[PDB]
Assembly symmetry: D2
Homo-oligomer: 492 residues x 4
């Protein structure tokens, strides 16, 4: 497939009540291409006043007796399935927009990101008419049952590293349960989300069920967090903004909260593993999506006996990583999202040598035709150094040493984060022991970054509150109501 050539950006306005509207203040804000630096377009900037309109529209579409409430649960799924069909029809345009806006290689935006979006809508389309309550054999002459009702108006805030994918991961389970949504994409990458607005309207979704409001964090996002008319907020982003999100809920209307926060997730290679396979997977586990992942390997604990040739094979392939333009079919890695992320990544690369790390290859040195950075491999890293404790979100791979299994479990777990973790080995005892000992939400064995629409995903500890994906992602978007009926006499 090919990136669609002269791609007009047709949708740049605010999406409220299935209508395109200008910002209340009149302001707009620029969207940028990270592969050059040229401004792509300008998008209407939502602020608090725009959020108040989106919430009023979402509340009306959720009122009792509305089109969205009375709709058969199975027809909720048919709409989600039809959204997947429209995305598949415009898969090239959407993937082109994702390479243009986020700087991802087009061929993996087409075959990875867009596939996960299509599969997510298809997967949750089947769940809509399969969300069950229960009947309970209760004491006394009573008949007790539960209903899994939708919570209501849901505010959703998503980052920039997977704009279209995170958009699907948020609205698909929310709409599957019958909620209405006010979602605010990252200010850096709002375009694919806004294009989804036209697909949502084309699919047949009732007005006000999904409202897309592009804007900045402290303005439009903080308006969502403290809004008294939003029943539930789903936030995916940094830990510190997550603490603000949690505080805003308790301060305002005690809205229900889930936070996906990521962390410094370990990657454990053992001597038993196939080195050719472990090198490539731990490479993709940290370098994929220009390293801007929280599942990112970052730390790579390698056993004593294989540490040397592991680094040898890492830098070997890390030097063939074809950096270049996203629209080029040869490009493996595109540029970072913006300058500030392109900057504070290089502070930490300079911090690596400033604390004593054998910088093998890497260090940054690409023609500034964009926001590109040279693939970097550090070694002789220790738990003390700053590059081991804070996340990088860049093509920086840090390799460490370990001897005992018991020492690598403590070293991997000694972290207030804990989103994911990986183990590479063929011993079944050590694979089961390490996986069961990890304080992380997802543990991969002999693989990395293997996400699926069917499997729940979330973080332990401070990285954080809640679960997404799979069936368990639906519990986040449902409210349990118990009904107890007095009956003349109970039997059975």
């Amino acid at each position: 497939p090919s990136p669609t050539p002269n791609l007009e950006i047709k949708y740049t306005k605010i999406f409220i009540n299935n209508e395109w509207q200008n910002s209340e203040s009149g302001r707009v804000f620029p969207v940028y291409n990270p592969a050059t630096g040229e401004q792509v377009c300008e998008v209407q900037e939502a602020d608090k006043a725009d959020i108040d309109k989106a919430v009023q529209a979402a509340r009306l579409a959720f009122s009792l007796g509305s089109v969205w409430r009375r709709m058969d649960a199975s027809e909720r799924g048919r709409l989600l399935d039809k959204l997947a069909d429209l995305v598949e029809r415009d898969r090239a345009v959407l993937a082109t927009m994702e390479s243009l806006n986020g700087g991802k290689p087009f061929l993996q935006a087409f075959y990875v990101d867009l596939q996960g979006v299509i599969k997510t809508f298809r997967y949750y389309a089947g769940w809509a008419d399969k969300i069950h309550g229960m009947t309970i054999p209760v004491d006394g002459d009573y008949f007790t049952f539960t209903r899994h009702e939708p919570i209501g108006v849901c505010g959703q805030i998503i980052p920039w590293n997977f704009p279209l994918l995170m958009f699907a991961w948020k609205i698909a389970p929310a709409l599957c349960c019958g909620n209405t949504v006010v979602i605010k994409p990252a200010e850096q990458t709002p375009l694919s989300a806004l294009y989804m607005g036209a697909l949502i309207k084309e699919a047949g979704f009732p007005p006000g069920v999904i409202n897309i409001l592009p804007g900045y964090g402290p303005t439009a996002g903080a308006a969502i967090a403290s809004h008294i008319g939003i029943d539930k907020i789903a936030f995916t982003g940094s830990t510190e903004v997550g603490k603000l999100i949690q505080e805003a809920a308790g301060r305002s209307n005690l809205k229900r909260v889930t936070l996906e926060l990521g962390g410094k997730s370990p990657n454990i290679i053992f001597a038993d593993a196939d080195l050719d396979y472990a090198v490539e997977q731990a490479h993709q586990g940290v370098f994929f999506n220009q390293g801007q992942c929280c599942t990112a390997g970052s730390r790579i604990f390698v056993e004593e006996s294989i540490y040397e040739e592991f680094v040898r094979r890492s830098v070997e392939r890390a030097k063939r990583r074809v950096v270049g333009s996203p629209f080029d079919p040869t490009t493996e890695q595109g540029p970072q999202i913006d300058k500030k992320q392109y900057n504070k990544i290089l502070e930490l690369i300079q911090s690596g040598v400033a604390e004593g790390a054998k910088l093998e290859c890497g260090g940054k040195g690409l023609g500034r035709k964009g926001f590109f950075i040279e693939p970097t491999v550090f070694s002789n890293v220790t738990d003390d150094m700053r590059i081991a404790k804070e996340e990088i979100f860049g093509p920086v791979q840090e390799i460490l040493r370990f001897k005992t299994m018991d020492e690598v479990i403590e070293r991997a777990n000694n972290s207030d984060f804990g989103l994911v973790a990986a183990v590479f080995t063929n011993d079944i005892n050590k694979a089961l022991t390490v996986s069961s000992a990890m304080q992380a939400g997802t543990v991969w064995i002999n693989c990395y970054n293997a996400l699926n629409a069917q499997s729940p995903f979330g973080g332990f500890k401070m990285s954080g509150n809640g679960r997404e994906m799979g069936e368990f992602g639906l519990r986040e978007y449902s409210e349990v109501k118990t009904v107890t009926v007095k009956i003349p006499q109970k039997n059975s």
Copy 2:
């Protein structure tokens, strides 16, 4: 059954690591009998230092390879089952302790509160080895499964209206899932929980699994809520404090939060209801436990056809209610918990009269000692009155009239709260339409109020976050870890 004659309070110390300790500061605080105002005993006052010692003991009991972590899940249930046997053996002592400390009539504490405690422990004893994960058929060559593991150290804060029952509601699901507990009972009523510590040690729970720290809210409670070594907080209490808990959790260590906050629960009576039965059930809905239930049917809506007779019957029933000493088997209504509650109820009663409501009976304090209040009935109450919008945790009944089902549905839902609701009718269509339309976590039909170990209990809107009781109470105390293994072929 009779009250324990010369009830000595044997356990007045802080319970950490299965050992009775004095407070780090040496302070004690008094405990009073609300029926006479006399001081019953003094109890060691836990503060921040004692909380810190409890958390480190609870954390040590939860570390890998400990007795509580290595113990069979079925053996966790054996311990909860043994605890229920000990509560059953000392049922009269604990009921007398609840009556003397809390003012509940002894027969009600024996047959209602103590029965709920025993059935709660026996219920969750059976859940321990039945908490199941799932295996998921993901795309590709993968074997994906999930584990449901304990959260960690759980901080628990409970109020004074059902001291022993709230104690069991909190620790039973937490222990069932394998966590450890630091629990702070209300400063008004710490005696039942301290006696449970002795039963906890007698049953054979490992040291540090349950730690009980009697103390005050701003000192002991706030230290629990802001502790960075506590993974999860479960709070039951006022909405104003509940806001401070969710806030302090976000700015500290992003601990998971459970809130049970209650509300202003409506009770709808249609003309096609067993009038004599509805009068009695709505009478118990307000007056049970001295009106100090969050499920209190504060606003009783009556259809206009039966309004005058329902008022006349409710007033006669309220004039017959026996207020007196809790130890007297004739007593139906004990005192309020303290002078703070007593004063806030008397002021609200004054507000109802000043705003035009018809004081049908009562409205004044009873006697000179204790905190007894006359059973009070207000008629002609409208939605805008203060007594109709504010929670009166006291023996005050409020009767409002309505005309149509759609009118009473909007009025009953018009509330920041949504904990509980009830409808009394013999029409199946009215019963199902109203129960489906209520914005409340529990809806009762022709009853008030059937709670049970099997039925989930929570609230909509600002009445709480999450659920207690039943299977769904377990989900608050487990965290999901997803494990994905790369496999050679996969055969579906």
Copy 3:
């Protein structure tokens, strides 16, 4: 829509391994149009040799590493959803094939039968990748999980009264779980099932996953029931043949068996019901599908106060029911399936008049072409009559009379059958008491033949084994495998 004129029957051969084949013997059998009595076409007759070829093809399509076994579960679902798209495409063709072969009014076949077929495939298309096993916290140092695997080759035998819907209800959950199918449609109505094989081929199911073999009962069916290479048989039909089915399973393979057998289902109407609504619901409860529903409410119990009035409206509606050609848009009732069924009905109608029952209308045939029977209403029926104890698969409505609730529960439950029951009342107490006291797998309250793609069926006592539809229909088509892995220590 309109019936496709001069419909050409194109598929008349045996469908094995996605190939149309002739009989191994060469024999063929005729298919008739029961509205005009003459021959539609000729269809290949499958026998033991042909079933053997089907089983061998189904066994190969299920072997390890095959396309069907290696297929992602979500891709099994998209195949089922493509099949629903195709059925929707040829909807008017299949409805015309169902009116022509089965005598159903075309609009009823279009808007009811095929609406259920499409929704059934779409519903089970969503279940394919959501069949979850479980992980269990067993005692000892063990990790235990379960896999829900397909059983294997499933033999399926269906009757003639809902040929396309029966076909869908059988293969949809079977394919959803990953099984392969050898299905034998009723010899009276094999056409629409054979057309499905063309849609199966077009949708892209692997060869041999579905094998459709038209033939006769004691030949093709008995070969299926006794075949040693078939893992599970699913039979829907008469009770007597069902006894032969389970005997063959025990005599041969110990294959898993589920049966869907007769009904003689009671319909209970109380005086407080809306008589206009109940008269029509209980009228469709008997007369729908020419009275040839196992769920027929052939025992209408009416409260004494409304009996003679209920009889009058039931009589007036019966004489108004338009009987005629199914292709005619004004036709409500078509003909019976064949001559054998036509004779048994009249021999039971004459059984009622030879005994005490009062014949209010109809009672005889209509002409010569087709097997049309007048809409018939019997009054004053008692439990002793043959007409109240034997299943009448015709348009014969019997109206009994009762006085008390305890009486009608006793009379309704007095039956070796127990597939279905209905209650019409606005009182919640007698609705819940009667519905709980019924000995039937489905109880309808203030409705009747309201089946859905969700919600199980049948199926109590001698009326069935196991359940179809809903999630529980999947339980019949999976086998549990427990895997226990020894681990070093185990915690949590």
Copy 4:
């Protein structure tokens, strides 16, 4: 613990309606000690007349409105909890009965058999009030929920190899779901079951809920399997008799059938496994309970490289196995159950010698009295040999050679049986490939004969129909009733 001194057999009568009855014919049958051939006692022999009295008592106890049907689900669990306490109190007496009557070593009965009995009753005690139905979001204005009710009278027939444990596995899930039971223990071993009748009465079960009828297969057993008033039969577990059970059920009243039939279970030892550990677990997998487990165990496939060393170590262990009196604390292996089994094993041992297998050890009977057989090991066994097929319910080990995993999977699966499989390896890929490929209801990895109350147990193919143990064991003893209520509006 030591065997009960002398031990009197006090309960030798038929247990019906909580009363001890004589046989209707007055006949008794002897019970023997298999270690000495001497007669222990005589027991009333139940026949068709006694079964009819038991079914009548079981039907009345199941009557609507009876104590057993009105009892809270939680109180059904309390009774199971009390029965476990009584079994624990009399653990030594029941262990001595199992040893004296069944031939098991006393310490094995005490620590293995009765531990399983106690844990089984305790496990299902917790399930009673946790059997949940579901509420279903169906299309249209409908409210649909399911109730899981007891089936009714459950006939149960169990074997002699694990008398008390089979008794608990049968009645615990049946009583947990609220059924009533008519159970026939094996004629060889009725003593433990009859003693349980005394504890059942002492625990406080209502009369007629459990009825224990000692007798023979063709008399008492065949009357149960063909009884018209029995709703469900659960059988265990000879395959030949299992065919008669499923056939008689279809011929009688189409009662529901669960079968737990035999097996020739493989044990696959790979080269990369702990050899000393695998030799011992494969030894116990064959020789435990005198080789009288259907979870044997017989066919041990060993990889070629370790074949001869595995064989030598297995012979060394077999020559050391201590055979002698069950009461002697040093005994590892008691006698066979009776002369019929004794002769059956010696016959098959001759078949192995005549067919060319290498008799490395054993092959003869031990002593002149009892039914002791030397621990016997066959090497150089091949698939075609008679001993490689055909269940040897005795202390006979057979060791087969293999290379390549694909070969051993095809050979281990080459069986009409499919109850159990095991694999010993440290490679996670081999362990997961084999366990997923095995056609068996239970696969063990690096262990054998684990088994717990929490994990379901059953057979593939002709090894059984359905599942016992775990949550899935409850699915066999419940009937799903769907209730659908038409509602006015319907919202999410």
